[PDB]
Amino acid sequence: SSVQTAATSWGTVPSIRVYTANHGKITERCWDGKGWYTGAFNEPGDNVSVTSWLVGSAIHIRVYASTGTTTTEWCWDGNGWTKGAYTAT
Amino acid sequence: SSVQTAATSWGTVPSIRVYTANHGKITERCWDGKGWYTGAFNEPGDNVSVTSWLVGSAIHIRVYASTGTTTTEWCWDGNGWTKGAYTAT
Amino acid sequence: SSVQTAATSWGTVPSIRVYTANHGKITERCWDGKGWYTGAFNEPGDNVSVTSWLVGSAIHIRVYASTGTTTTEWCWDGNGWTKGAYTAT
Ligand SMILES: OC[C@@]1(O)OC[C@@H](O)[C@@H](O)[C@@H]1O
Ligand SMILES: OC[C@@]1(O)OC[C@@H](O)[C@@H](O)[C@@H]1O
Ligand SMILES: OC[C@@]1(O)OC[C@@H](O)[C@@H](O)[C@@H]1O
Ligand SMILES: OC[C@@]1(O)OC[C@@H](O)[C@@H](O)[C@@H]1O
Ligand SMILES: OC[C@@]1(O)OC[C@@H](O)[C@@H](O)[C@@H]1O
Ligand SMILES: OC[C@@]1(O)OC[C@@H](O)[C@@H](O)[C@@H]1O
Ligand SMILES: [Zn+2]
Ligand SMILES: [Zn+2]
């Protein structure tokens, strides 16, 4: 079925991250001003949303991956992807 | 059917808002730096998107809730959710 | 099927762009503080996401339009929409 994307950007270059839910798997493509490349994020999901914010020049990213009625938060704080404290209720 | 989410964030703490369209109903979870709690937003929708912007330290949120071919805009400007002027045509 | 939207905003007025994927067609509605109107963007797609950034006072917008397993990026840089370099792999 048709894939589903979510996008975020930061700075003025800019950096862009595009997340794609594709048949149960979410992957990440990256732009930092000089070509698209595959990012490290790879987790299960039928649906994806994202938001990001800067603290100074350090980017923080939250990706929300949903399967069925279960949503899992993934956190990027500059040094690795980790599961977040988000709960749905 | 998997639920569908949309997310926005502001500031450096940050504040995060996650909207979940769950089989026709959109609810909202909130992070302001010290735990996830349920927000005031409760409206019908199969699909949801969001954007937000700061005027000084005041957050303004716009949520776009879609059912069928009807999209309703909901506005947070500090003191309650109100229907916005958005129309598709 | 219910339509699916993506929203972005910039400035303090603000300007808002809302993209709606509606049965294969993505269209755009615009707010610059003085009423909603229809924007130039009109391209095919079953799913849509968007991000934007400012460089000074100039807005740059990226719309990710997906049909099947194909995602096409559309770029606004002040002077018309053009296809972007985004690729999924
Ligand atoms: O520089 C690329 C990278 O480290 O940027 C932050 C996140 O997007 C990561 O998944 C990604 O691999
Ligand atoms: O740094 C991780 C974290 O504390 O960031 C704020 C929220 O995203 C939380 O759910 C998350 O666990
Ligand atoms: O402090 C929580 C709250 O008031 O923040 C602004 C909006 O997200 C509201 O729906 C939400 O209840
Ligand atoms: O104050 C509310 C409002 O004027 O804000 C800007 C746009 O979101 C409009 O649709 C909306 O009615
Ligand atoms: O002034 C309206 C407009 O030029 O703004 C930038 C883009 O949203 C365009 O599609 C749109 O027509
Ligand atoms: O100016 C257009 C462009 O170079 O902007 C940055 C990225 O969005 C690229 O995919 C895109 O082609
Ligand atoms: Zn279901
Ligand atoms: Zn339909």
Numbering used by the authors:
A (entry chain C), B (entry chain B), C (entry chain A): 1 to 89
Which sentences from the paper describe this structure?
Here, we describe the tsclx4-/Zn-directed assembly of two proteins: cationic α-helical cytochrome c (cyt c) and neutral β-propeller Ralstonia solanacearum lectin (RSL). Sulfonato-thiacalixarene (tsclx4) provides possibilities for protein surface recognition (e.g., lysine encapsulation) while simultaneously supporting a metal site that can bind to other features on the protein. Whereas sulfonato-calixarene (sclx4) consists of phenol monomers linked by methylene bridges, tsclx4 is bridged by sulfur atoms that enable metal coordination. The metal-binding capacity of t-butyl-thiacalixarene has been explored extensively. In each of the model systems, incorporation of the macrocycle–metal complexes contributed to protein assembly and crystal packing.
The other model protein was the neutral, trimeric β-propeller Ralstonia solanacearum lectin (RSL, MWt ∼ 29 kDa, pI ∼ 7).14 The histidine-enriched mutant RSL-N23H was selected for this study as it can bind zinc. Co-crystals of RSL-N23H with tsclx4 and zinc were obtained at high calixarene concentrations (15 mM) only. The structure was solved in P212121 with four RSL trimers and one tsclx4 in the asymmetric unit. The four trimers assembled in a tetrahedral arrangement, similar to the assembly of a six-bladed, β-propeller fungal tectonin described by Varrot and co-workers. While the fungal tectonin tetramer was assembled from protein–protein contacts, the tetrameric assembly of RSL-N23H was maintained mainly via zinc coordination by His23 and the adjacent N-terminal Ser1 from two protein chains. However, one of these sites was replaced by a tsclx4—dinuclear zinc complex. Here, the calixarene adopts the 1,2-alternate conformation, with one zinc coordinated on either side of tsclx4 and bound to His23. His23 forms stacking interactions with two monomers of tsclx4, and a coordinate bond with zinc (Nε···Zn = 2.2 Å). The zinc ion is further complexed by two phenolates, one sulfide from tsclx4 and one water molecule to yield a trigonal bipyramidal geometry. The tsclx4/Zn complex makes a minor contribution, with only one complex per four RSL trimers (∼120 kDa).
